[PDB]
């Protein structure tokens, strides 16, 4: 094929794979954020239940990486605008 | 150098760096998954050991992002198929 | 525009978005590492405070993914060296 079509097709192929990787990274980060926060709640509930009638300074922290997860999903979508339209490679 | 060789070389350079980043992301996610699950087990063991003879509703969750980690490693490898073979830029 | 300029501009656009995604991934991983380790410390402090005068084998693990986070930030920066300089597309 024409050199420019080989280049454009290989680029578009790579972008599609990178798009998949961004969605996978965002999904994994969201699941980690959910479990970390659930387990922080469990630990804080344990401290409270040990203290309430039928260790006071111990507090589990929560995580919020939602802006980062949303950005990854945004980039995965907007990379469509960086794909090369082969019909625009004039001849 | 020829314009197409500059483009192809810069593309191939970027893909190699992105490949490294995918492997690093997958490694980091795996280590987080391991520690999160180890600490969930530790918390659940604490609740159990406080209750067994020498807080019942408290349960730490586990995380499984293995499909996402495997996909990142898969993309890092398969991006090799998106590299531009310079020998195929005919003259 | 010229086909090579379309290709080079689309490539440079994609790299910039991928750079943003790497910085976001590194930021999210750092926040998860911080909270996971803070909550490991909280759990270990709980075990200790239950045992000290006014469950011994229970120990929360810590995570260290700093090499991976640093690599992601390094790639996000060094991808600048993979951008195509349009002034070098001679005519």
Numbering used by the authors:
A (entry chain A), B (entry chain A), C (entry chain A): 917 to 970, 1169 to 1205
Give sentences copied directly from the paper behind this entry.
Based on the knowledge on CoVs, the infection of HCoV-19 is mediated by first receptor recognition and then membrane fusion. The spike (S) protein, which is likely to be cleaved into S1 and S2, is responsible for the two processes. The fusion is mediated by a 6-helix bundle fusion core constituted by the characteristic element called heptad repeats (HRs), HR1 and HR2 in S2. In this study, we solved the crystal structure of fusion core of HCoV-19, and screened a panel of peptides that may potently inhibit virus infection.
We first positioned the HR sequences of HCoV-19 to residues E918-L966 for the HR1 region and residues D1163-L1203 for the HR2 region, using the SARS-CoV and MERS-CoV sequences as references. Recombinant proteins of fusion core, which consists HR1 and HR2 linked with a peptide linker, were expressed in E. coli cells and set up for crystal screening. The structure of fusion core of HCoV-19 was determined at a resolution of 1.5 Å. The HR1 folds into a long α-helix while HR2 exhibits an extended structure from I1169 to Q1180 and folds into a canonical α-helical structure for the rest part. HR2 interacts with HR1 in an antiparallel manner. A trimeric structure of typical coiled-coil could be observed by simple symmetry operations with each HR1/HR2 complex in a crystallographic asymmetric unit. Detailed analysis of the interaction between HR1 and HR2 revealed that multiple hydrogen bond interactions were formed between amino acids from HR1 (N925, Q935, Q949, N953, N960) and amino acids from HR2 (A1174, V1177, I1179, Q1180, A1190, N1194, I1198). The results indicate that an obvious hydrophobic face could be observed in the contacting face with the other two HR hairpins in the trimer. Therefore, the formation of trimeric HR hairpin was mainly mediated by hydrophobic contacts involving residues from both HR1 and HR2. Overall, the structure of HR1 and HR2 complex of HCoV-19 resembles those of SARS-CoV and MERS-CoV, with root mean square deviation (RMSD) of ∼0.918 Å for 73 Cα atoms (superimposed with SARS-CoV) and ∼0.881 Å for 70 Cα atoms (superimposed with MERS-CoV).
